[PDB]
Every structure is written in C-alpha cells, then in structure tokens.
Amino acid sequence: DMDTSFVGLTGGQIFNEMMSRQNVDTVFGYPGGAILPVYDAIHNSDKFNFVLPKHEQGAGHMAEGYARASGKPGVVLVTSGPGATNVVTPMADAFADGIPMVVFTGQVPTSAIGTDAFQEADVVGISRSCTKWNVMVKSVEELPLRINEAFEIATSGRPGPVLVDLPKDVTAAILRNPIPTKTTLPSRAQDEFVMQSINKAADLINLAKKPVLYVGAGILNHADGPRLLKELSDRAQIPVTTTLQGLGSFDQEDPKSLDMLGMHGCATANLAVQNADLIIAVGARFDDRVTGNISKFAPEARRAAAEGRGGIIHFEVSPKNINKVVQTQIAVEGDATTNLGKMMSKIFPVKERSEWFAQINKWKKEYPYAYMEETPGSKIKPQTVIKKLSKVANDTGRHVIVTTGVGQHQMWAAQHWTWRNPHTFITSGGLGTMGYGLPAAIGAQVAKPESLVIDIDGDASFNMTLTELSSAVQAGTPVKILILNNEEQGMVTQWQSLFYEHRYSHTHQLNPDFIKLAEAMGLKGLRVKKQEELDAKLKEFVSTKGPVLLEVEVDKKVPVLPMVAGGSGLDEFINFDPEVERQQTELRHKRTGGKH
Amino acid sequence: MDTSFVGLTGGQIFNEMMSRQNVDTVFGYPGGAILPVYDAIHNSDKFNFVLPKHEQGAGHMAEGYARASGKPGVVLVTSGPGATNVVTPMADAFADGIPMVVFTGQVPTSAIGTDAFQEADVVGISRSCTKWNVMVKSVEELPLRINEAFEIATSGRPGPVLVDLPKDVTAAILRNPIPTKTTAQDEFVMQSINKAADLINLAKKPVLYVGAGILNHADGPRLLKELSDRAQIPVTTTLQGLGSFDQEDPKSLDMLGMHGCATANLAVQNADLIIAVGARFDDRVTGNISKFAPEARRAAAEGRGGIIHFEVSPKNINKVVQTQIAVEGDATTNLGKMMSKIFPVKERSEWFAQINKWKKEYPYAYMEETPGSKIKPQTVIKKLSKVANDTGRHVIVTTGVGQHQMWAAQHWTWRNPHTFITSGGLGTMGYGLPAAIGAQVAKPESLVIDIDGDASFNMTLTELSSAVQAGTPVKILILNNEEQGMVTQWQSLFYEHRYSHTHQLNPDFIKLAEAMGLKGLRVKKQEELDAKLKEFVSTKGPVLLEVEVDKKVPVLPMVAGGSGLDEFINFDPEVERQQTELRHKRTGGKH
Ligand SMILES: Cc1cc2nc3c(=O)[nH]c(=O)nc-3n(C[C@H](O)[C@H](O)[C@H](O)COP(=O)(O)OP(=O)(O)OC[C@H]3O[C@@H](n4cnc5c(N)ncnc54)[C@H](O)[C@@H]3O)c2cc1C
Ligand SMILES: Cc1cc2nc3c(=O)[nH]c(=O)nc-3n(C[C@H](O)[C@H](O)[C@H](O)COP(=O)(O)OP(=O)(O)OC[C@H]3O[C@@H](n4cnc5c(N)ncnc54)[C@H](O)[C@@H]3O)c2cc1C
Ligand SMILES: COc1cnc(OC)n2nc(NS(=O)(=O)c3c(OCC(F)F)cccc3C(F)(F)F)nc12
Ligand SMILES: COc1cnc(OC)n2nc(NS(=O)(=O)c3c(OCC(F)F)cccc3C(F)(F)F)nc12
Ligand SMILES: Cc1ncc(C[n+]2c([C@@](C)(O)OO)sc(CCOP(=O)(O)OP(=O)(O)O)c2C)c(N)n1
Ligand SMILES: C/C(NCc1cnc(C)nc1N)=C(/S)CCOP(=O)([O-])OP(=O)([O-])O
Ligand SMILES: [Mg+2]
Ligand SMILES: [Mg+2]
C-alpha cells in the first residue's frame, strides 16, 4: 500500500508535516547551513513553538527539562559540524537519565560525506554510545520512516535520546516517488510468564516482615505510577524510600516515607534498607551512588534470600538492567506501574507493622538532616535557604518545578526540600552535568507555562551555561534563578577536604557580578548577604512576575552530610558533628595558610 | 630500565611528564575522576594553569594557545560531562589540524563498562575527531602513552589526541621500574622534487596556492618568500594561510575562494600551473570542482603544466583534484630542497600586467558610509587594522564565525605568520573569545584582538570572567548587526528573504562586560568610531568594544551554487539598494 500525499514536497516540508503528526508542540534549535532547508520549511510554522538558545548545548538541556516536565519527547533541531557536536553532552545526559529526546542534526550533502567537508562531523559515530539509536537519512523517501522510528524508540522501553542525521540534499530534495503508507503513519506466553513472576513476587511480599519499597525514576514514566505506589504502600504497610531521580513520586509528608537513600541519603532510609528482609525495587537501577559498597549492601535481604524468606524483587523495563548489579530473586519484566496494578489484588492487606515502624521512627528521631545552623555574625547557611524556600514556594499554592545544577546545592535541594508531587524535581543524576539548571528550567517552563519554575543552582554550575539568561527573556519564560553562591566548586572542595588534606587544586573560579549580569541579560537581579533579609528576599524572589535571579551569599567549605564514601556500607555513613566541623575549620585554616 | 618514577602516584608521574614534554601551560577543569591528577599538580611550579568556566572554553583556549605558540595545547578535564564538553574543540582541532593533547579523567577500571556515575565511552566518542586516542590501563604505561600522545599530536599533520585516565590508575603508585625508553622512499621524493622543479621552470602563468601547511614550520614563510621572489610567482593564500605571506608585497593576490579576492580567483582559473603548498583543496576554496582551474587542466593535458601538491598527508593527495606531481612530506623542508633547482625569473610582464589590471578592476568594494548612515562593518576592519598596527606592538587576531570573520579576513592587511587564528574547517561559533585568551597566554606581550560577531560571542561569552582571572588583557570587538549575518545572507540570497530564527536577542554587551569585570565601550555614531577604536586598543587590561554596524549587508565577492571561481557575485551599489527595497517589501518593513 502506497501513499502519494507527500509527493511534490521537499524533505524539509515533509519534516514540518511529520512534526504535527508526531504531536510535537515545541522545537528547540539553532540554524546553520546544512539544516537551512528545514529551517525554511518551518519558517513561521504554527505547528509548534520554536525556542532559540544562544548555544546548542542549551537547546539540548532545554529539551531535556521540557521532556521531564511534560512527559513528551524533547525535540532538537541543529546544524552540522559544531552544531551537532555541541549537543553531545545533552544526549549523553539524557542517555544516562533515561530522557526521551529526538535530536535532528543537519548534515553535509550525501556526495560530500566522508570527504572531510566544511562543517562535517561523523555524528552518527560520535553519538553511537550515547543514544538508544541513531540513523542517517539517505533519501527523502525514507525520511518519514526514520522520523517515526526515532520517536518510537525514544519513548518506548527505557526512554532515551535518539539522533537523526539530515543531509542537506535530502531535506532540499523533492519527493518524486510514492512511499509506503505504513512508513508515514506513527505474546501469550510472555504475558503468562510475567504474570507468573508477578505471582511469585506477591508471594514474597506477603511473606516479608520488614519490607522496604526502593523506588526510582521508572515509577514516574507512567501517569498512574505514584498513585499505585501509594496504594501498594498503604495496602501492605510498606515504607518507601526513593533515589535522587524518584523524588516527587512519594509524598514525603506521609509517615511511611523514608526520604532519599544513598551516598547522601537520609540515615533512616539507608538503615531501613540495610535491615530489610525484602527490598522491592521499582524502577531503579542500583547505581553505586545508591548502594554504596555493594558487598555490604542489604545484608538482611541477602540473609533472607539464603533462607528462602526474602531478598530482592525487581520491577524493571529493560533487560539490560536486570541482574546487572544485584542478584535478584524475582525480576518482574516491563512497565512497573502496569505490573503493580496487576499484582495489587494478590497482596494481602496488612493491618500494621509495629516493630518495624517503631525502629524506623526511632531512626528518624535520632538521625535528622542535621547541620551547623546560623549564629550571630555568621554567613547564611545553604541548608537553611532550601528549607525556607521550600516552605515559601509551597505556600504559593502554585505547581512548583525545581531544577538544579550539580554539586552540594543539588544534594541540599534534594535533602531539605519537601517533595510531594511527581515530575517536580528535574536534576542531572547519572552524568551529572554542570550547567543543567538554567536551560532545564527554561525547558520545563515552556512545558508548564503556569508552573512556578525554580532553578536552584551553584555558582560554578551557573557559570557553565549562564548565557542562556537572555534566551529566557526571548522565550518569555519567567524562571526563578536561585544561586547558592559559596564562591567555590563546593562538591569538589568537599572531596579535597576529606581525602586530599585540604589541598584545593583549581576549584575556585572567579565569579561575575551575578546581579549586574542578570540585568545586562534583561532580568531582575536580587542579592542577599544578611540573615535578617533572607525571608523578605525569598518572598520578593518568588513573587516577581517575570524572570528573576536571586544570589544568596552562603557559607563556604560546608560538607554535605550524611555521606557514605570509600568502602563504607550504607549504614556506615559519616554523620554531622558540630565539634568535628569546628576542628575541620581550624585544620583547614592552618593547611591553606589562612586562604580558606 | 628507569626507576625515577618509582614511588610516585600516576598523577605525580603526569606532573613530571608535563615538565619533560616542555609544557608551560595547562587548560582544564577539575572533577571526581581526575582528582588524583589535580592533587598532584596542586601548586605545581612546572607549568601555569588556566581555569575556564566551561570545558569547551578550555579546549578552544588550548587551540588558540597552540596556534600562537607553535606548541601543543594541553587540556585536563574530568570524566563524563567534562569529557563530552571538549568534543567540539577536538572536532575543531581535527578539522584545522591543530596540535592538542586532551587528558580526560575516567571512572575506575573496576567501574568501566558498567554504566557508572559520570561514565562515558570517551575513546569511542572521540575516535572520529582525534588522530589517535587511548585509555591508560596501568600506571606503568602512563609515561609511554603520554609520550606517544605528544608525538602523534605534533607529527605529520598536527591534530588532537586523547588520553583517557582511569581514577585508580592516576591514584596508583608505581612499584616497579619501567623501560627507560618509555619515559629508499626519499628517492621517490627527490624524484618528485626534480619533476616539480621542471614544471615550475616551464610555467608561464604560475600561481602559488598556499595554505596552513606552510605555517607548521618556522622557516615556512621565508622559503615561500624566497621561491616567490626567485621565480616571480604570485601568491594567494587560503583563510588558514593568511599571515604566511606579506600582503603588501606586489606579488600578493590576497585570499582566494568563496569569499576571496576576485584577482586571486581569476589568477587561479587562468593559471597554467598551480603550486599547492600546504593546502587541501577544500570546496570553500575551489568552488565548483568541475570548473576549478580550467587552464591548469588544459596545460596538464598538453604536458606544459597542471597541479603540483606539497602535502604531508598521503590521504589528502589526489583526494579532491587530480594532480600531476605529488611531493610528500613537510612543505617547507621540500621547498628548501627544491630551491636550488629553480631558474631565477627576472620578470613576468604579461602575467603581472593581467593580474594588476584585475586588482584595479576588482577591489574589495562595498557600500561605504554616507551622512546619517550606520557604521559599515567593512570600514571598522580597515580602521582597526591601521589603529592596531600604529601601536607598534605584535598583533594577533582571533574571530568568531560568520560575516565578521570574512570581513576580518578580507580587509585586514596580513603580514606576520601566526597572527590570524580563526575556525575554518569546522567553523565553530564561540571560538573567538577563548581562542584569544589562549593566544594571549602564549604571547603575553602581544596585542590580542577578538573580532567577533554578536551571535558567535553569545555562545561562549561566559569566558569573559575567565579572561580576568587568567590575567589576559584581550581586546574584544563585537561587530553587532543584531543578527546571524552569514545565515541571513544565505536566506536573503537563496530563500527569498525568509529569515527563519536568525535573530537572537542580545544582552547589553557593555553592562555584560562590566559585570564580568572588564571595561565596556560602545560606538553608534560614525564620528565616535576613530576615538573609540584608539581608546579600545590603548586600554590596559581586558576590554570589550561593541560597534553597532549596518544590517543585512552581504559579504562580497561570493562564489556559491554551481559557480566556478571566476563566476563570483560582485558588489554593485544599485543592486544593494534594489535588494534593500525587495527585502523591505518581503519582510513587511521589519528588515
Ligand atoms: C553529586 C551527586 C550525588 C548523588 N548522590 C546520590 C544519592 O545519594 N542517592 C541517589 O539515589 N542518587 C544519587 N546520585 C544520582 C545517581 O548517580 C543516579 O542518577 C540515581 O541514583 C539513579 O536513580 P534511578 O535509578 O531511580 O533512575 P534511573 O537512572 O533513570 O534508572 C531508572 C531505572 O528504572 C528503569 N525504568 C525506567 N522506566 C521504567 C518503567 N516504565 N518501568 C519499569 N522500569 C523502568 C530504567 O530502565 C532504569 O533501570 C547522585 C548524583 C550526583 C550528581
Ligand atoms: C564562513 C566561512 C567561509 C569560508 N570561506 C573560505 C574562503 O573563501 N577561502 C578559504 O580559503 N577558506 C574559507 N573557509 C575556510 C575553509 O573551510 C577551510 O578552513 C580552508 O579553506 C582550509 O584552509 P587550508 O587548506 O589552507 O588549511 P587546512 O584545512 O589545515 O589544510 C592544510 C593542508 O596542508 C597539509 N599540511 C599540513 N601541514 C603540512 C606540512 N607541514 N607540510 C605539508 N603539508 C601540510 C594538511 O595535511 C592539509 O592537507 C571559510 C570558512 C568559514 C567558516
Ligand atoms: C548560512 O549558510 C552557509 C554559510 N556559509 C557556508 O559556507 C561558508 N555555507 N555553505 C552552505 N551549504 S553547502 O555549501 O551546501 C555545504 C557544502 O557544500 C557542498 C557543495 F557545494 F558541493 C559542503 C559541506 C557543507 C555545507 C553546509 F553544511 F554548509 F551545508 N551553507 C552555508
Ligand atoms: C568531587 O568528587 C566527587 C563528587 N561526587 C562524587 O559522587 C557523587 N564523586 N565520586 C567520586 N569518585 S568515585 O567514587 O571513585 C567514582 C566511582 O566510584 C567507584 C567506586 F566507588 F567504586 C564510580 C564512577 C565514577 C567515579 C568518579 F568519576 F566520580 F570518580 N568522586 C566524586
Ligand atoms: C555552533 C554553531 N552553530 C551554528 C553555526 C552556523 N552559523 C554559521 C555558518 C556560516 O557556519 O553556517 O553554517 S555563521 C552563523 C551566525 C553568525 O552570526 P554572527 O556571529 O553574528 O556573525 P555575523 O557577522 O553576523 O555573520 C551561524 C548560525 C556555527 N557556525 N556554529
Ligand atoms: C566541578 C564539579 N564536578 C565535575 C564536573 C565538571 N564539569 C562538568 C561539566 N560537570 C561536572 N559535574 C562540581 S560538582 C562543581 C560544583 O560547584 P557548584 O556549582 O558551585 O556547586 P556547589 O558549590 O554547591 O557544590
Ligand atoms: Mg559553588
Ligand atoms: Mg551578527
């Protein structure tokens, strides 16, 4: 069966048509020679909104933030050569964090490919290891097919980035042949096997006496995910901890909430996991930033497994991540949410778990997120800023979205914010890309025009992509940019303090005047130094109509705690100790000859 | 066998190896995976360290450094996003043949292949944009790999290499001694030299087609000048060859190609012999390849001329155009060997008469200022060229990518080697500022000027604060036409003035400069331009000058479409006015 409707159109014009057929409402991009035939076709197009950054990396991270906030794939449209190489970091970032993204790169004409042409890059080769799939379109005839395959692959299984390489002669060419209609249009034994494993997992859960739900980003890839998670938690009385990327999937005000686990997770979550007889892993991949020393990980679960009375259940959509890190007793293949729904009726309702929750509540009382609080004459504490802003933003009654950079401010945002809503924490976790914060916020704001979007950023992170401030003005995105300025690459100085005897090698970048910068870029700029002005400034920050930057001068050389590092198990975290911090301050002064 | 490194960590070995390689500057940004190296180079007296805001900045700085100094640029970044952020500079250095050694931290070997935190397949990603790369797998082979890297980056055609450094390798202590070392065809060439000298002595209308290759040797420009003087041969250069020949010399043809001087293009098309020296016949130079140099091909068919190619990389020989004589190896070296076999020529009356008539007929014409009109971008280049030269200082110029780049290339008078540093092959916007910073580090006493575009500058403007921290008093000139000029030109020409997303919203560049810690200057009026240009150059410390220039001004001449070099579009004042009215009509008076 053939389709003749695209006959007579250029490749560019076909691209434009395929965007509305693929339900694309937003395109992030930057023009150039190779991709000019497509840009002429989308000129003044009302199929979608176009967002123009200052740098293609910005386009990439914007599309990511857009994808995370909307649940739709982020679409990028850039030129060949430097245009394409400039989106390599965002693709690798989306690949690590499972973000659906379709990247369209212009390419030199097919006759010039492989001749080391002007602005030619081997983009398909470069991006092979950091995309789910990529392809070079070699004729206009196969353009709709490739577009359809790209979007499907990007949004199925574990979502991820795909790249489509678009030769200039292909997008300029007129389609002069009918093409298969199928290319233009966007097992019983397996089901029985999945159900079998679902039955097995239900049996294990009904047996557990100290279960823990270990929840990650996977639960958020379905609209009903958080809802079914809660239903399972309430039905079987199971406490819930989340990874960094699962934050927002569970109401942290709920008594059964364990908060975040891992390297910088809540001690209670870490201890609960270390003492659980059953770990129910839902959409999480057991990264070492979560597990700590893997040989020390979940000893009570391993003991339960050896005695046939527990262990680890894994709801995982990708075969690649099953039995990858941890020996699992039961793997439940496919969409976590879907499989939770199927399992629910098989779970015995539990009245209470007195002993287990008594232990957990005692851990909660003993190990809060403690830190050195403000004293007279001291600088503002970064942890205090997060706690205050969390309440201020939440009290607005608006839907709040938070993006971050990478480092200490990121962890403190994760810890001290109170998470309650799905798809409201957007942070770079796997690749951990500095500079993510501002463009991701712009993207998220585009996805959710009514939401209050806050970028909680670091000074070093913000410097990476700060040129996109003007892009926010041009895009009409009233993002709220918060800079926790400690005048350092804090996460690195933390590691240098701990393991390199306070040798701070090249970890202090010279910052610009962030307030003058913001105003030069066309935003309102605010600064706070004094403890007494923090409250009022935070309120003015959140209340501002347009885009606004607020720089908070915060204290320096403050470690993120708790911390699981070295060969420590999850239950061998370093805890906050006020006397230790004081001793570290003296030691630091002496070792740095008074410089820090 | 050598024991001098026994007891040192991999990072400490790296520190010593930089000294042994004669490295005086490292560009980089720290992170988890590369931490053991940064600890070892902490307060190192063996080299200076330059810290950017972005790894792309580090990369382009290293490029600018390499191009001004003649030494390889050294980059030191962390794993994952640190490494992926230097892909564009590597592709840039690969395209332009710039010596660069990139050191990327990597996750511990025990975590490689497990999709670990901040893990990327950097060896895989960078394969197509490096001459060579490697992952160091033990501390014992670290000196060997460092030595290989520097050797490969600086030999043949120079280019980028990458060395992946697993954290556990750089933290590991060398326990065992390592081999001290790790710490016929010339006749075929001589025959070619003889044959090429025979062709040259026979040529009646020869042209020296000179590129970046002649600048990869200290004595390149000198031997080029000698050959040109000896045989009375006119010299044209590529964009990347600018500075290798004195453009004030009567035999200068200026730049050839897509936006080259018409005289240069016409000489090439009418030459009976083309002597290609360190140039790779890119289509930005040749135009339509089937129309390129018809008289040279004709001479070749009659055995009285053709094309001679002095090229160091065999794969670039007969890659684009069929050549009669190939001389493999370093161009400068082979020019020296050839010199004694070239008959001296007193004069070429007819050939230079024809050339000098073209020069009079086809200068770099453009619509000049009129009372009330905006400042013309071409005029700024001419005036700045004189003002900068009048300082008596050594001047180095970097640019961004676009119209300003071409106008810089055209209207500047190039006389000194390694003084024009621009992204040619990859054509990376945002190149100008970080390249200028790196060049200033290489040549602290030089006057370094970034002639940048507004769109290009926006790409990497965050490095302005890095200029302050590095102590590099760069001079930043922004030709502000409030547009992606080179793209709007192509849209005006080929897409009926449909300007699709080619107008980015600029920040206040002066307030930006001041926020970054620089002095900011702005010119709007013609009357202020001269004074502002002089203040700009005479300013001590880093300074930005924004010039509001006229918009929608095409770079001419232009060879595009299926045109041959002699089929260029030339400037015409009446055509420009007609284009202005047509553009107004089609954009509803918006442009
Ligand atoms: C400075 C820093 C510190 C960090 N410290 C911590 C920390 O203390 N604690 C922490 O948790 N993280 C931390 N990380 C982040 C960490 O590196 C990982 O990014 C994070 O642990 C991964 O979370 P995740 O497994 O839930 O999400 P992902 O990496 O996205 O993995 C999701 C898993 O679920 C699967 N999946 C996806 N969709 C579905 C579906 N529909 N159905 C079923 N399965 C699905 C995926 O295939 C994948 O296996 C830190 C990062 C940084 C930069
Ligand atoms: C907007 C724009 C417009 C442009 N328009 C033009 C234009 O009009 N004219 C123009 O010329 N360029 C133009 N370019 C630049 C063009 O794309 C190429 O960068 C340039 O033409 C290549 O110059 P090159 O061959 O001299 O140097 P390279 O690309 O570096 O090639 C040098 C050649 O010499 C060889 N070589 C290197 N070292 C040695 C040695 N020691 N001995 C012998 N051989 C050696 C190399 O292997 C290579 O083959 C433009 C770029 C842009 C962004
Ligand atoms: C704004 O668009 C351009 C600006 N400058 C340019 O060259 C310096 N080009 N060149 C093109 N197109 S191109 O000329 O067809 C071409 C190209 O030309 C081959 C063809 F002429 F044989 C070769 C490689 C790349 C490109 C590219 F990416 F730019 F499309 N578009 C522009
Ligand atoms: C400033 O340094 C760090 C900041 N934050 C970190 O984790 C969130 N890490 N982690 C490390 N080193 S690491 O822990 O040995 C490690 C790593 O751990 C392996 C080991 F724990 F088994 C795995 C992959 C990458 C890294 C890397 F690159 F960061 F070094 N350094 C930092
Ligand atoms: C990373 C990157 N992205 C896009 C690019 C595609 N290009 C260009 C080109 C010629 O390479 O077209 O292929 S030039 C250009 C815009 C130039 O704006 P300007 O700086 O203001 O200078 P002007 O004086 O106005 O001309 C773009 C968008 C590029 N090279 N790099
Ligand atoms: C350099 C670095 N890590 C390595 C690194 C390097 N380069 C990039 C692109 N990304 C990362 N993550 C960090 S965490 C910097 C943190 O500084 P910050 O922005 O100001 O945050 P904070 O100070 O609060 O920890
Ligand atoms: Mg900081
Ligand atoms: Mg411009």
**What letter does residue B413 receive in the DSSP assignment?**
-
Give yes or no for a contact between B538 and B562, defined as CB atoms under 8 angstroms apart. Answer: no
Question: Three-class SS of residue A93?
Answer: helix
Domain identity same for A417 and A564: yes
Domain identity same for B32 and B158: yes
Query: Are the Cβ atoms of A513 and B515 closer than 8 angstroms?
Result: yes
How many CA atoms lie within 13 Å of A184's alpha carbon, on the beta-carbon side? 16
Question: Three-class SS of residue A78?
Answer: strand
Ligand positioned closest to the Cα atom of A121:
3
Helix (H) or strand (E) holding B279: none
Residues 517-546, chain B, touching A (beta carbon < 8 A): 517
Cα–Cα distance measured from residue A385 to residue A538, given in angstroms and rounded to the nearest whole number: 9
Give yes or no for a contact between A412 and A425, defined as CB atoms under 8 angstroms apart. Answer: no
**End of a domain among A349, A368, A387?**
A368
Q: At what angle do helices A354-366 and A267-275 cross, to 10 degrees?
A: 150
Query: Are the Cβ atoms of B505 and A43 closer than 8 angstroms?
Result: no
Hey, what are B152's tokens? 């490969």
**End of a domain among A153, A187, A221?**
A187
Domain housing A498 = 369-596
Annotated active-site residue A415? The verdict is no
Helix (H) or strand (E) holding A89: helix A88-97
Question: Three-class SS of residue A61?
Answer: helix
Domain identity same for B488 and B382: yes
Domain identity same for B104 and B59: yes
Q: Which residues of B are designated catalytic?
A: 55, 117-118, 167, 486
**What letter does residue A420 receive in the DSSP assignment?**
-
Q: Which residues of A402-437 are buried (b: 16+ CB within 10 A; e: fewer)?
A: bbbbbbbbbbbbbbbbebbebbbbbbbbbbbbbbbb
The sign one gets for the Cα dihedral A365, A366, A371, A373 is positive
**What letter does residue B178 receive in the DSSP assignment?**
B
Q: Is B53 on the interface with A (CB under 8 A)?
A: yes
Comparing alpha-carbon positions, the chain A residue that sits nearest to B509 is A520
Question: Three-class SS of residue A456?
Answer: strand
- Chains A–B, number of C-beta pairs less than 8 Å apart: 232
The shortest C-alpha distance from B204 to chain A (Å) reads: 32
Nearest CA to ligand 5 atom 14: B402
Give yes or no for a contact between B164 and B134, defined as CB atoms under 8 angstroms apart. Answer: yes
How many CA atoms lie within 13 Å of A117's alpha carbon, on the beta-carbon side? 18
Q: Is A142 annotated as a binding residue?
A: no
Nearest CA to ligand 3 atom 6: A33
Hey, what are A577's tokens? 């100790």
At A152, the amino acid letter reads E
Cis peptide, bond prior to residue B557, ω within 30 of zero: yes
Give yes or no for a contact between B122 and B85, defined as CB atoms under 8 angstroms apart. Answer: no
Ligand positioned closest to the Cα atom of A407:
6
Query: Are the Cβ atoms of A85 and B91 closer than 8 angstroms?
Result: yes
Domain identity same for B5 and B138: yes
Query: In 3D, which of B86, B159, B107 has the Cα closest to residue B316?
Result: B159
Cα–Cα distance measured from residue A309 to residue A243, given in angstroms and rounded to the nearest whole number: 25
Give yes or no for a contact between B61 and B50, defined as CB atoms under 8 angstroms apart. Answer: yes
Hey, what are B226's tokens? 């000698």
Hey, what are B284's tokens? 């930005």
Cα–Cα distance measured from residue B108 to residue A442, given in angstroms and rounded to the nearest whole number: 35
- CATH code: domain of residue B425: 3.40.50.970
Domain identity same for A574 and A454: yes
At A87, the amino acid letter reads V
Hey, what are A455's tokens? 């970028």
Domain identity same for B164 and B205: no
Beta strand B235-237 pairing with B273-277? unpaired
Ramachandran category for residue A50: left, alpha or beta (phi over 0 → left; psi -120 to 50 → alpha): beta
Query: Are the Cβ atoms of A39 and B111 closer than 8 angstroms?
Result: no
Cα–Cα distance measured from residue B360 to residue B73, given in angstroms and rounded to the nearest whole number: 42
Q: What is the dihedral of CA B88, B91, B94, B98, to 10 degrees?
A: -10
- CATH code: domain of residue A352: 3.40.50.1220
**End of a domain among B363, B387, B422?**
B363
The shortest C-alpha distance from B397 to chain A (Å) reads: 21
Domain count, chain A: 3
Q: Is A339 annotated as a binding residue?
A: no
Domain identity same for A393 and A510: yes
At A168, the amino acid letter reads K
Contacts of A96 (CB under 8 A, 6+ apart): A429, A430, A431, B115
Cα–Cα distance measured from residue A48 to residue A45, given in angstroms and rounded to the nearest whole number: 7
Backbone angles phi, psi at B366, to 5 degrees: -165, 165
In ligand 3, the atom with minimum distance to the C-alpha of A117 is 24
Contacts of A170 (CB under 8 A, 6+ apart): A11, A110, A137, A138, A139, A140, A143
Residues 222-251, chain B, touching A (beta carbon < 8 A): none
- Considering only CB atoms, which chain A residues are within 8 Å of B586? none
The distance between the two most distant Cα atoms of chain B, rounded to a whole number of Å, is 79
- Considering only CB atoms, which chain B residues are within 8 Å of A430? 115, 117-118
Q: Which residues of A513-548 are buried (b: 16+ CB within 10 A; e: fewer)?
A: bbbbbbbbbbbbbbbbeebeebeebbeebbebeebb
Apex B34 CA angle, B29 and B36, nearest 5: 120
Residues 274-333, chain A, touching B (beta carbon < 8 A): 285, 287-289, 324-325
Pocket flag, ligand 5, residue B402 (CB < 6 Å): yes
Contacts of A121 (CB under 8 A, 6+ apart): A80, A81, A82, A84, A85, B91, B128, B129, B426
Domain identity same for A172 and A25: yes
Cis peptide, bond prior to residue A562, ω within 30 of zero: yes
In ligand 3, the atom with minimum distance to the C-alpha of B259 is 8
Domain identity same for A224 and A123: no
Experimental determination approach used: X-ray
The shortest C-alpha distance from A589 to chain B (Å) reads: 17
How many CA atoms lie within 13 Å of B473's alpha carbon, on the beta-carbon side? 11
Give yes or no for a contact between A144 and A182, defined as CB atoms under 8 angstroms apart. Answer: no
Beta strand A2-3 pairing with A179-180? antiparallel
Task: Give the number of other Cβ atoms within 10 Å of residue A379's Cβ.
Answer: 17
Domain identity same for B101 and B195: no
Query: In 3D, which of A69, A71, A13, A25 has the Cα closest to residue A51?
Result: A25
Domain identity same for B368 and B357: no
Query: In 3D, which of B397, B415, B416 has the Cα closest to residue B407?
Result: B397
Give yes or no for a contact between A278 and A205, defined as CB atoms under 8 angstroms apart. Answer: yes
Helix (H) or strand (E) holding A440: helix A437-447
Query: In 3D, which of B571, B558, B566 has the Cα closest to residue B271?
Result: B566
Task: Give the number of other Cβ atoms within 10 Å of residue B463's Cβ.
Answer: 29
Q: Is B324 annotated as a binding residue?
A: yes
**What letter does residue A128 receive in the DSSP assignment?**
G
Cα–Cα distance measured from residue A480 to residue A469, given in angstroms and rounded to the nearest whole number: 11
Question: Three-class SS of residue A481?
Answer: strand
DSSP of A309-365: S-EEEEEES-GGGTTSSS--SEEEES-HHHHHHHHGGGSPP----HHHHHHHHHHHH
Q: Is A408 on the interface with B (CB under 8 A)?
A: no
Pocket flag, ligand 4, residue A395 (CB < 6 Å): no
Beta strand A278-282 pairing with A311-316? parallel
DSSP bridge pairs for B399: B451
